[PDB]
Structure formats: structure tokens, C-alpha cells
Amino acid sequence: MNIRPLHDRVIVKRKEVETKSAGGIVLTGSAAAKSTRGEVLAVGNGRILENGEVKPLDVKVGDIVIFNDGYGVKSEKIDNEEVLIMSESDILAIVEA
Amino acid sequence: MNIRPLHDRVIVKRKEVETKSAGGIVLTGSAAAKSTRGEVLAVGNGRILENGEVKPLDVKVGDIVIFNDGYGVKSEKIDNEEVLIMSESDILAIVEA
Amino acid sequence: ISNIREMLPVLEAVAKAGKPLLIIAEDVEGEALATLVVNTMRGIVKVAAVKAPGFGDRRKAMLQDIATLTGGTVISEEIGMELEKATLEDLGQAKRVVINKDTTTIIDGVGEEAAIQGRVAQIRQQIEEATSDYDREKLQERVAKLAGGV
Amino acid sequence: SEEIGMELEKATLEDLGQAKRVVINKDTTTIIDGVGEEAAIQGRVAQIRQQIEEATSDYDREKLQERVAKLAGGV
Amino acid sequence: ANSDETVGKLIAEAMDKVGKEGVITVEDGTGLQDELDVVEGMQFDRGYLSPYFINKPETGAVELESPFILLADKK
Amino acid sequence: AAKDVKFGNDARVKMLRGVNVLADAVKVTLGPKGRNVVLDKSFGAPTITKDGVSVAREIELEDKFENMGAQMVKEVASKANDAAGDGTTTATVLAQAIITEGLKAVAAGMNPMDLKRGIDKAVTAAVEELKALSVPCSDSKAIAQVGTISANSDETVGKLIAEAMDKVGKEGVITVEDGTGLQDELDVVEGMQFDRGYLSPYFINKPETGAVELESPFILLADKKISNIREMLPVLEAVAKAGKPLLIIAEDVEGEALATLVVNTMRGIVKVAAVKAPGFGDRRKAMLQDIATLTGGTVISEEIGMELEKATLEDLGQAKRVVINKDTTTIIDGVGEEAAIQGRVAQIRQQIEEATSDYDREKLQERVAKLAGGVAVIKVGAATEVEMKEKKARVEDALHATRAAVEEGVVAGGGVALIRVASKLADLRGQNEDQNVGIKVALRAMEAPLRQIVLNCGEEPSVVANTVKGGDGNYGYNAATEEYGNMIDMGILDPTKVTRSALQYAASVAGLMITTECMVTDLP
Amino acid sequence: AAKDVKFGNDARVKMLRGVNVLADAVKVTLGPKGRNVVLDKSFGAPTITKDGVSVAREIELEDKFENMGAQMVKEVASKANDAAGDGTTTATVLAQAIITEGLKAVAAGMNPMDLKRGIDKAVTAAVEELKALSVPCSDSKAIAQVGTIS
Numbered sequence A, B: 001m002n003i004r005p006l007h008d009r010v011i012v013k014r015k016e017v018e019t020k021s022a023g024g025i026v027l028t029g030s031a032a033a034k035s036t037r038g039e040v041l042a043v044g045n046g047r048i049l050e051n052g053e054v055k056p057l058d059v060k061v062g063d064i065v066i067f068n069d070g071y072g073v074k075s076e077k078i079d080n081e082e083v084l085i086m087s088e089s090d091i092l093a094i095v096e097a
Numbered sequence C: 001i002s003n004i005r006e007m008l009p010v011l012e013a014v015a016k017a018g019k020p021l022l023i024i025a026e027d028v029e030g031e032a033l034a035t036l037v038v039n040t041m042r043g044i045v046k047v048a049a050v051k052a053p054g055f056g057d058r059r060k061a062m063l064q065d066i067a068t069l070t071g072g073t074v075i076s077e078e079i080g081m082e083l084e085k086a087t088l089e090d091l092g093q094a095k096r097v098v099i100n101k102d103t104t105t106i107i108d109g110v111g112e113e114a115a116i117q118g119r120v121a122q123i124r125q126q127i128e129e130a131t132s133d134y135d136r137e138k139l140q141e142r143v144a145k146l147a148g149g150v
Numbered sequence D: 001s002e003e004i005g006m007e008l009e010k011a012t013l014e015d016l017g018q019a020k021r022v023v024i025n026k027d028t029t030t031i032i033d034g035v036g037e038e039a040a041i042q043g044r045v046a047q048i049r050q051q052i053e054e055a056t057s058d059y060d061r062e063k064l065q066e067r068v069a070k071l072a073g074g075v
Numbered sequence E: 001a002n003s004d005e006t007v008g009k010l011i012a013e014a015m016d017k018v019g020k021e022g023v024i025t026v027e028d029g030t031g032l033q034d035e036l037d038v039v040e041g042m043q044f045d046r047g048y049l050s051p052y053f054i055n056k057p058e059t060g061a062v063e064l065e066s067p068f069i070l071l072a073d074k075k
Numbered sequence F: 001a002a003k004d005v006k007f008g009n010d011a012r013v014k015m016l017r018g019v020n021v022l023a024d025a026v027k028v029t030l031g032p033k034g035r036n037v038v039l040d041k042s043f044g045a046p047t048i049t050k051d052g053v054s055v056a057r058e059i060e061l062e063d064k065f066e067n068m069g070a071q072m073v074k075e076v077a078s079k080a081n082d083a084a085g086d087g088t089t090t091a092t093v094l095a096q097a098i099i100t101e102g103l104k105a106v107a108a109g110m111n112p113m114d115l116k117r118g119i120d121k122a123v124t125a126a127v128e129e130l131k132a133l134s135v136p137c138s139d140s141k142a143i144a145q146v147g148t149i150s151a152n153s154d155e156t157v158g159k160l161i162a163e164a165m166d167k168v169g170k171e172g173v174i175t176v177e178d179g180t181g182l183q184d185e186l187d188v189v190e191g192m193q194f195d196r197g198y199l200s201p202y203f204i205n206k207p208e209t210g211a212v213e214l215e216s217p218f219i220l221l222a223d224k225k226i227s228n229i230r231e232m233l234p235v236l237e238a239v240a241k242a243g244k245p246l247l248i249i250a251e252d253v254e255g256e257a258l259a260t261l262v263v264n265t266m267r268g269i270v271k272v273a274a275v276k277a278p279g280f281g282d283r284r285k286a287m288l289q290d291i292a293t294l295t296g297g298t299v300i301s302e303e304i305g306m307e308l309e310k311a312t313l314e315d316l317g318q319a320k321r322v323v324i325n326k327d328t329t330t331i332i333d334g335v336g337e338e339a340a341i342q343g344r345v346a347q348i349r350q351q352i353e354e355a356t357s358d359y360d361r362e363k364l365q366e367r368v369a370k371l372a373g374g375v376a377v378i379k380v381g382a383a384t385e386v387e388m389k390e391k392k393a394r395v396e397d398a399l400h401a402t403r404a405a406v407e408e409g410v411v412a413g414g415g416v417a418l419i420r421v422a423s424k425l426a427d428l429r430g431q432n433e434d435q436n437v438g439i440k441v442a443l444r445a446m447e448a449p450l451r452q453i454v455l456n457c458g459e460e461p462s463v464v465a466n467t468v469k470g471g472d473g474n475y476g477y478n479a480a481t482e483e484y485g486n487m488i489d490m491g492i493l494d495p496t497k498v499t500r501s502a503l504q505y506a507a508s509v510a511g512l513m514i515t516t517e518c519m520v521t522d523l524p
Numbered sequence G: 001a002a003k004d005v006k007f008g009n010d011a012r013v014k015m016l017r018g019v020n021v022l023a024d025a026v027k028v029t030l031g032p033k034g035r036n037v038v039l040d041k042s043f044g045a046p047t048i049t050k051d052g053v054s055v056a057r058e059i060e061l062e063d064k065f066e067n068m069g070a071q072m073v074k075e076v077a078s079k080a081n082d083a084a085g086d087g088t089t090t091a092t093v094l095a096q097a098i099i100t101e102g103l104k105a106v107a108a109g110m111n112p113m114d115l116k117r118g119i120d121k122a123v124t125a126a127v128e129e130l131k132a133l134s135v136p137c138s139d140s141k142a143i144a145q146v147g148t149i150s
């Protein structure tokens, strides 16, 4: 089954644990560090705060995103796959172009 | 590929680790200190806070800025280049003239 | 001397006069020294640095000797002074200096023999009221380093 | 060295030494035939020449003579 | 060496190869006969930091040709 | 401290009483009619032994000078033993002989430095002569004969040694340890096995042995401690799909991981077992590599930047069966092709060549055996502890002499080889007369071991030596049967390397000693 | 430490007095007309015992050689006991007996290593003999007899 994040929470999936390429030709062996990029899988209707109306989120289903990996984020398992649940407050940018 | 900061976040690049000149003729060797100046590469649409409307940021793409280097700021890598991601809350001034 | 900041106003007044500089301080540690070393290396300003003579109380008095011989002004935080507020004028001067692995030597100081002879006439009576045998050796040494030879 | 205020990062190929072959064991590295011109070799040897002259000690003398040999003749 | 022609000869021989600025040291031997080692040029007392570098396991030692050398005066 | 200095014949005389008290305690044990010495111990019961270097190490004398004597000849016996673990009494006997004679000639007023030169020349010559009489010992029978003769004529030791040497092959280790009962027993473990038990007694699928057994199992080699089960999952499940059991040899398996493994194997999920890695420190990783090779698996260490999670079935080693006890894992028949087995063996071949140490040599030879031949253990039987000690020592002793036979050959025992090289050098001469006596001094000592063998039988050394000297080749005196004959045919073989080390070492120190003119030491 | 070495008959005689002091303390206790020995104790009251391995463990002698005698036979009594917890006196008695007689034969000029082989042969044969005389003890009455006689 798939997931449905509650208003303002966003469901994303992590990317590569130090993709062995950085710098150029040199395949940097894992230096004890994690990835901050991720694919957005689902979106909550949007933040309700301050009563009057409910604003959408500025990320769509399937965007590529740099987030801030911190306390806001949680680790979960869907069909046995590594997925994260943070709020848009934690999403920083979108890698495009 | 290039980057697209999420509303209110700003993407900047750092400048010189104690440019060897300060004082005058003397090339001050690195004293264990970093730079607070930087070039603005991308801008988020702007802060959404308090529902009603969404105000732009007062920094444009390509400004030179003094920011406050602190917790608000994060370190990332684009095409293999050292770029930082803080919100306008952390930008203090713009060096012009 | 730990912070190079303390030096800058001075080091640069010297870079403008185009003359080299000796630094005799209580000590020159990591942060300051390193940078001095980097600055002298690149052909910026010709400089050298070397510990002060002896320790304890005589250091200050003996560093004063050095002041007198070269017509400079001792910069201590005791009279409430800062390195930063020191123009070229405070600096001593000589015609040549020579320093080894463990030996600094100043040749021919700018100090007028009016002031040289005077400071010598003071350490003249230091020995007269030196009520000890060890407090007598050092004074006679200094007298020789300022008057005759060793 | 970080003593002259230097960073590894700011080092082009040019800073690197070079040789024709190197051989290293469990406890022995050895460089065969270095690119350094004998102009500079002979010079640095003429410096450690006088290190021994003013080596006022017996133990500060052994090491210098060693190095001379590793740079000039053989061990 | 109390009339030991062989000592005479080995000394003479070493003196000849390491030249005039070369060290000669004596240490216990493995077998019954005296033996003279002469190391050619420059070499010091340091092994690889990981036995993985070893591109020739038959010697148990590392070998590189025309290599650049990075000299870092720091950990 | 103030010293007591002693000069010429005076210092020598004391030196020689010194050599003598030792030499005599050592002699009593020489040959088949050897007798035993008892060496006391503040520890516990005394020690009864026949073993020259054991007696020798104990001798220390009260006369500071006599003592110097003794502490110097003591080294022949000591080196003799570090060199071939046998012949140490013979060694002793030749030195007491080279000294006795040598000194007597310094009293005649020869120049001892020349006495010495001739004694060495004599000896260098004798060693060549031995290499020339030496014939290879390579059938199982001869090997038994060296063992047997080494073990004071214990045919059973000869045999057992010969037997082991046969099964573990040429690159196999043989070790001796106390046995349980009264009779000697030879164990031979087949192929590869090390000192590690299951990490939980729950893995045990066969309680009657008290031990674990798996067939066609995959082998997970992890060069790292295992705490998180997460690290395992991708793997454990690839194995559950192939329906085969799994051995886990890691640096260790602790609480969290282990517990769960234990829970998973229990419920009949996947058949698994786990056991610590062999040894510690640096060899672990190299030795775990051995296991990789034997079973055609890939070591998974965080050193090459590897993660357990990223390991398919392919990385796993494999074998046909494994057997693990309370403290013993053993892998039977690994999948590794003998192309790769033989290769990794050809590497640890030269590990020993450049093993500049004695302890860095033992381990390598062990591994070679666990990968090539087999490992054998002998258990010595004895009624008592006084008995186990002396017997065990002899087996040990002969274990050595056979290893020596095999690498260097055999010559005629009962001191015959030496008595024969002595007539071969009847014509040796040196640069001057003193050296000529010095030569003759050694040739004469060369008779010593046969002379003592005989005297220990209570017959007359110089009648026996005369008749032996009157014969040829390998004619010699059988002390045990008190009859003459061919010593090779009678199986009285000395390993050449020992007969030669006896001569070398005894002359090497006897030589120096007879050139004492002053002796310095402490006041009483 | 400097050592005292003793050879042949000299060393054996000492050896034997050794065996003897020990053997004789242990013997007084053999059989139903056994008597007791008293072994002192720095601890508290002495110990009266009939039990050969108890007496044996105490004997240590002042002559270092007589002592080696005693410390050697002492293991027969000791092993006998680890093996069946009984018969330790008898064992001691037999050894003193094998030794006495044997040494007497070494003095006759026999070759001890053979004296030994013959003693062992004699024994391996005796042990077979014993297994032959042995009849099972399996009723309660016989068990009580071994108990009782023990």
C-alpha cells in the first residue's frame, strides 16, 4: 500500500550515500556522511496554521529536493523501502534544469 | 544542473578565507577564520508566513552580501562547487558602490 | 605575543620605511609567529623574532637595557600600553643584527651616549646596594654588555 | 607544511616531487633516482656539509652524516 | 682485527662503495659468514601504512614507476 | 664492586673445574646406556631428565671462577638445542674434550691463538667431510629410526613420528601434549580447523555430540564485529531463498545481532551458526582471508570500504560440510579451486622465507598446513607426572631430530661419523706447528662421544674406540647389543645437521675458552 | 643460586635416606594394626591421622638431597590417592621396596636402565594377573566388606 502524509508533511525518498564521483575521476570512499537530496513521493494538502484557509505546498509529487536532514524528519518503511517524512519547513530547494 | 531555493531560502557562494591584504601591505596568514561575504546565486519566491500573500526577497540574483554565518546556514555541492543555503533572515547587508 | 592583530599598525609603518625589523618580546608563540614567518618568507617585510633575555624580574629591566642602547621604548602592558598604539618612533634601531640557533647580537645602537652613559651610571649603584652575591653577578654582566665587553 | 601557511588543497602537480621508481616493504621505503638536478642536490649537500662543522655535539653529528650519505654516496 | 684479512677486505670494500661521506655500521649476521650490504642511494625506515597498497605480493612489497611524490609535513 | 682478577694457569685451572662440573653432570646421560639426572625445583616435585640442555642450564657454581667456566661451556649445550633440539650432550662432551686437550697444550707453551686457528681449520674440514658422508633419509623406515634412536631406543615413538610425518605430509605440523591415559596416541585432523566454538549453544542441531553440523553451507566472512542485524538482512534472505544453511565467521557476534540470529535459527527459519574469527590482531584478517580462499568467498571488511548489506550470495564462501564444538570450528572440503588454493599457498610459502623472526614463523607454517596438508597431534602417555615430563620431552626431542634428518640427512651414530671424519683429516695441517697441534687437539676430541657412549655402558672406551677405528665406513659399535656392525643397517642413525651442530658449537666456544689468560669477576 | 651437584652412589645414598624418612613415617600406618601419626600445624591443634597421603605431603627434609628423595617418592602416595582415594600407604611401601632392592642392584653393577625395563615388564604382567584374579563385587554384603576394610 502507499502513503498519505497529513497536511504540510511531505513524503520523500533518500539518494546516494556519497555517490562515488565527487571531485572528478576519484571515487571518494564513504567518509561517514549521508545524502541530502531526495525524490518527493507524496504531498499533504498543506499547512493549516492561523485558522482562515489552508495553503498548498510548493513541492509537487516527483520533484527532486535538497532538504535539511535534522530532527523534523522521521524514518519509516513502505513495502520494505527507506522513506522519510518531514515537513516542507525542512525542504530547502529543488534541483531542476 | 542548477538549484531552486524554496521560498525565503537564498543560495549564495562564499568568498576568500582571509584575503591576504588586510591592514595594508601585510599578507595576514590564515588566523583560523572564515569569510562572511558571498555572491547570491538563487532566490526563493519569498517568505509565506502569516497566510495572506507572499512577500518577495530584497536580495537579487547576483548581489554581493554580508551574511551571518551560523546555524541557519547549510553546506551543499553543485556540479562540485561550495555553495551555502541560508534564509534572508541571515543576510545582513549588501556590499555595493 | 599571540595575536598578529596587535602588530599590524606597526609592521606596516615599517613596510613603508623599507627597513627590516627585530622583535624581542617575552615570547612569540604559534598564531603570531606562524604569520610572521609567512610574511617574512614571501618577501613582504624583512623580520626576525627572538625570546627576551633571562626570566622573572631582570627580563624587564634587561629588556630596558636593550631599549636604551638602541634608543627605543619598551612596550609593556604594565604602564598600560598596547602594541597597536606604537608608531615607528617607539622602535629601537641599530646598524646591524646577528642571530644564531641560540645567540642574538645587536651591533652599534642608535642610542646617544648621553643616555647610554646615564643608564650605566644607574646600574653603577645597583652593585653598590646589591646586598647579595648572586644579585651582584648579573648587574656586572649587564654593565659590560652596555659599556665594555664580555 | 602548515608552518609556512600552506594548504594541501592549494597544491598543483608542480609542487610534487618525482622519481623513476620507488620500493616499499613492511618497514622500508626507498626512492630510486630523483628528478632533482644535481645543481640543487649538490647545493643542499654543501649546506649539510657545514651542519657537521658547527654540530657542537656527538649525537647531533651522527644524523647529519647519515643524511649526507642518503643524499650523496651510499649507506 | 687481530690479523683477520677478511675484515680488512670488507672494510676496504665498503669504504670504496659508500664513498668518503658514507656511513658504515656493523650488526649481528644471520649465518656463519660475514656479509656486506650496500644500499644504493636514498632509503629510510618506513613501511606502507596499509598492506593493501602492495601491488607485488611475491616480495610482500610495493613498487611504482615514474611516480609523483607528495610531501606533507603534517598528519 | 671490587673484583677478583685471576691470571694464567691459575685462572684456567679454575675455569676447567668449572667446565668439568657441568660437563660431568651432562655426560651421565649420553647414549642408550644413559642414566638420568635429578634437578631440584623450589616450585614442586623435582624433575628427572636425560636431556643434556636441561641438566646444563641448572649448573651454577659457588666459586665465581669455576662458575664462569661453567656458564661458558653452558652455551654449547644451549645453542646446540636452539639449532636442532638434540645433540646437546654430545656437543657438551666435545667441548669438554676440546678444552681439556687444548688447555693441556697451552701448558706445553703453545700459542693459544694458533691452537684455536687449527682447531677451527680442523673443524671446517670436518664439516665438509660430514656433508660428504651424509645420505638422504627419506623413506618412512629411516625416519622411524631417527625418531627411535632419539627417543633413547623407543621404537614406538619412532613409529608414531614416522606415521604422522606420513599423514600430515611435508608441510604439516606435528605437536606433542600430555595424554589422558597410559599409552601414546596420534590424532590427525583432516584439512582446515581452528579454535572457535559456537557463540550460543542454541545453534547446536546435534545435542548427542554437543556440536553443530551443516551441509553445503554458505560462509559469511566478516572482518568486523557484528552488533546490528540490519546489516545482515539483505544477505540472510538471499540465503533463505537458496535453501542452504549459513556459517558466520566474523570478528565477533555480540548481544543484539546474535540474540536475533539465535531466535531466527531456532524457529526453523534459516539454518545458521556463528563463531569468532581465528586469533586476534593482524593475523586474524590475513587468516580469515585463508578461509575465504579455501571456500571461494570474499572477505567483507570496512577497511576496503565495504558494507555487509551490499553483499550478494556470490561473496559468500561455500563448503560441503561444517562441524563446530564448544571451542572448535572445522570446515570440510571447500569449493575453492586448487588453482587459487595452490596460489595462496605459494604466497605464504615466501612469508616464511622473509619471516625474519622465530615467532612470526610458527604461525605461517601453521596456516600452510591448514590450507595444504594436515595437522597432527601426539599424546604421550604416563602413569605419573615425573614420567609424563621425561617421556613427553623425549617424543618432543625426536620429533625434532626427524625434522632434521629430513632436511639434512643421516650419518652413522655411536659417534662413528665423527671418528671417521677424524681419520679423513689425519693429513690436515696449518700454517705452523702450534696450529698442527691445534688440529690434532680437535681430531682427538672427535673421539669423545663414542668414548662416553661406551663408558656409560661400563666397558672400556679405548678398546671400543680402537676396534671401531680399525674398521671402515659405517662400522661401529652397537652399545645396546654390545656388538659391532654396520650402523646404518642396524638403524643407528644420527641426523647429519645435529652431528654437525655439536661439532660447530662445541668448537666455537671451546675455541675461545682455551685462549683465556685473565679472568675478572666479583669478590666472594 | 649456586648448586651442589652429587654423583652416583653418593647421590643415591642421600636419595635413599630421603625415601626412607618419608616411607617410614607412612608405614607406621599400614593395616588394621596400623598406628597413627601426628602432623603439627602452625594453624591450630595438630592432626592425628592414619592416612598415608596425609602423612606423606608433610615430609620435607633438611638435607637438600635427602629431600629430593622424599619429594620424589611422595608423588606415588599422591597419585595413588587422586586415582582411587585409597591404597596410598601400600603404594608408598611398594616403592620404598622397589627402590631399596633396585639400588642394591645398581651397586651390583647392573645397568639401571635395564633394571627399569625388567621392573616394568614384571609390572605390566602383574597387572594382567590382577585383572584375572579380580571377581566382580556387586552384592550389598561385599560392598559393605570393602567399606569396612577401608
Ligand SMILES: Nc1ncnc2c1ncn2[C@@H]1O[C@H](COP(=O)(O)OP(=O)(O)O)[C@@H](O)[C@H]1O
Pocket: F029, F030, F031, F032, F034, F051, F052, F086, F087, F088, F089, F090, F091, F149, F150, F153, F412, F413, F414, F415, F449, F453, F477, F478, F479, F480, F481, F492, F493, F494
Ligand atoms: N645402540 C646404540 N649404540 C651406540 N650409540 C647409540 C645407540 N643408540 C643411540 N646411540 C647414540 O646416542 C648418541 C646420542 O644420544 P643422546 O644421549 O641424546 O645424546 P644427545 O643429547 O647428545 O642427543 C647418538 O650419537 C646416537 O648415535
Ligand SMILES: Nc1ncnc2c1ncn2[C@@H]1O[C@H](COP(=O)(O)OP(=O)(O)O)[C@@H](O)[C@H]1O
Pocket: G029, G030, G031, G032, G034, G051, G052, G086, G087, G088, G089, G090, G091, G149, G150
Ligand atoms: N584383618 C586384616 N588382615 C590383613 N590385612 C588387612 C586386614 N584388614 C585390612 N587389611 C588390609 O589393609 C591393607 C591396607 O590398609 P591401609 O592401612 O588403609 O593401607 P592403605 O592406605 O594403603 O589403604 C589392605 O591391604 C587390606 O587388605
Ligand SMILES: [Mg+2]
Pocket: F086, F087, F088, F150
Ligand atoms: Mg639425543
Ligand SMILES: [Mg+2]
Pocket: G086, G087, G150
Ligand atoms: Mg586404606
